Amino acid sequence: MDDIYKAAVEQLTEEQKNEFKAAFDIFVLGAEDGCISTKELGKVMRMLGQNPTPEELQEMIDEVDEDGSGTVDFDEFLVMMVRCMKDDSKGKTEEELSDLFRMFDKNADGYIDLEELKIMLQATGETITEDDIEELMKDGDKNNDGRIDYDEFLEFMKGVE
Ligand SMILES: [Ca+2]
Ligand SMILES: [Ca+2]
Ligand SMILES: [Ca+2]
């Protein structure tokens, strides 16, 4: 990978720059020149949704910083917001298909039934009839409990339609 930390920095968009300039201008509150030591960076972590300690950020600055002064800069800072993917609990593949569950379920009954499936068919431009709905729960259902569920739609989305 041609520079994984400097790539995002050197490749900054003008839209995210106007947002970092303000967020970065607050992290330097109390400092002298306009940077962040460790306690000032604690506010940067709280933004995502975490309250780490100022002692754990110090060891993280020497790995991102490229000078050796013991402080973060407008450049070494953006690097910290690049190594963390945009997903703390989510992931991919099996996590990307779970999104269909929302549009598939309507009242959180498990997944879809004879009345809920009518919405998943209307979203598709394909022509749907009454025989296509009764067939959806036929092979689409493995337990035949009356509706479907994430465990069933998992294989149903393996290229069936
Ligand atoms: Ca530095
Ligand atoms: Ca439902
Ligand atoms: Ca079932």
Short mmCIF file of all heavy atoms in Angstrom, two decimals, residues 104-113 116, ligand 2:
data_model
loop_
_atom_site.label_atom_id
_atom_site.label_comp_id
_atom_site.label_asym_id
_atom_site.label_seq_id
_atom_site.Cartn_x
_atom_site.Cartn_y
_atom_site.Cartn_z
N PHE A 104 -37.24 -5.73 4.63
CA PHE A 104 -38.05 -6.98 4.55
C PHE A 104 -39.05 -7.03 5.71
O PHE A 104 -40.22 -7.32 5.52
CB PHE A 104 -37.03 -8.12 4.65
CG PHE A 104 -36.52 -8.46 3.27
CD1 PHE A 104 -36.01 -7.45 2.44
CD2 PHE A 104 -36.55 -9.78 2.82
CE1 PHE A 104 -35.53 -7.77 1.16
CE2 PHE A 104 -36.07 -10.10 1.54
CZ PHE A 104 -35.56 -9.09 0.71
N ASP A 105 -38.61 -6.76 6.91
CA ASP A 105 -39.53 -6.79 8.09
C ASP A 105 -40.31 -5.48 8.19
O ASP A 105 -39.85 -4.43 7.77
CB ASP A 105 -38.62 -6.96 9.30
CG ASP A 105 -39.42 -7.55 10.47
OD1 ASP A 105 -40.55 -7.12 10.66
OD2 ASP A 105 -38.90 -8.42 11.14
N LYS A 106 -41.50 -5.52 8.74
CA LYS A 106 -42.33 -4.28 8.87
C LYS A 106 -42.69 -4.03 10.33
O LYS A 106 -42.62 -2.92 10.82
CB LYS A 106 -43.59 -4.56 8.04
CG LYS A 106 -43.52 -3.80 6.72
CD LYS A 106 -43.58 -2.29 6.99
CE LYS A 106 -44.25 -1.59 5.81
NZ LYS A 106 -44.45 -0.19 6.26
N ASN A 107 -43.08 -5.06 11.04
CA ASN A 107 -43.45 -4.90 12.48
C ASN A 107 -42.58 -5.79 13.36
O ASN A 107 -42.99 -6.21 14.43
CB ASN A 107 -44.92 -5.32 12.57
CG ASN A 107 -45.11 -6.74 12.02
OD1 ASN A 107 -44.16 -7.49 11.91
ND2 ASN A 107 -46.30 -7.14 11.67
N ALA A 108 -41.38 -6.09 12.92
CA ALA A 108 -40.46 -6.96 13.73
C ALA A 108 -41.14 -8.28 14.11
O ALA A 108 -41.18 -8.65 15.27
CB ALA A 108 -40.12 -6.14 14.98
N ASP A 109 -41.65 -9.00 13.15
CA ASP A 109 -42.30 -10.32 13.45
C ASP A 109 -41.33 -11.48 13.19
O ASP A 109 -41.67 -12.63 13.36
CB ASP A 109 -43.51 -10.40 12.50
CG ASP A 109 -43.05 -10.32 11.04
OD1 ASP A 109 -41.86 -10.19 10.80
OD2 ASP A 109 -43.91 -10.38 10.17
N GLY A 110 -40.13 -11.18 12.75
CA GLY A 110 -39.14 -12.24 12.43
C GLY A 110 -38.53 -11.94 11.07
O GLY A 110 -37.33 -11.90 10.92
N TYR A 111 -39.34 -11.70 10.07
CA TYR A 111 -38.79 -11.36 8.72
C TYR A 111 -39.90 -10.97 7.76
O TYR A 111 -40.11 -9.80 7.48
CB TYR A 111 -38.04 -12.59 8.23
CG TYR A 111 -36.75 -12.19 7.56
CD1 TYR A 111 -35.59 -12.09 8.32
CD2 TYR A 111 -36.72 -11.93 6.19
CE1 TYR A 111 -34.39 -11.73 7.72
CE2 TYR A 111 -35.52 -11.57 5.58
CZ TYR A 111 -34.35 -11.47 6.35
OH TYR A 111 -33.16 -11.11 5.75
N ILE A 112 -40.61 -11.93 7.24
CA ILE A 112 -41.71 -11.62 6.27
C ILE A 112 -42.80 -12.70 6.30
O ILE A 112 -42.53 -13.86 6.53
CB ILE A 112 -41.05 -11.56 4.87
CG1 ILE A 112 -40.01 -10.41 4.83
CG2 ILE A 112 -42.13 -11.33 3.80
CD1 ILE A 112 -39.48 -10.19 3.40
N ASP A 113 -44.02 -12.31 6.04
CA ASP A 113 -45.15 -13.28 6.01
C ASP A 113 -45.95 -13.08 4.72
O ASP A 113 -45.48 -12.45 3.78
CB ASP A 113 -46.00 -12.98 7.25
CG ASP A 113 -46.41 -11.51 7.27
OD1 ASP A 113 -47.29 -11.14 6.51
OD2 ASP A 113 -45.84 -10.76 8.06
N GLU A 116 -46.53 -9.25 4.59
CA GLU A 116 -45.29 -8.41 4.54
C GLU A 116 -44.54 -8.64 3.23
O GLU A 116 -43.96 -7.73 2.66
CB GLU A 116 -44.44 -8.88 5.73
CG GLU A 116 -43.85 -7.67 6.46
CD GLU A 116 -43.40 -8.09 7.86
OE1 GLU A 116 -42.46 -8.87 7.95
OE2 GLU A 116 -43.99 -7.63 8.82
CA CA B 2 -42.34 -8.60 9.93
#
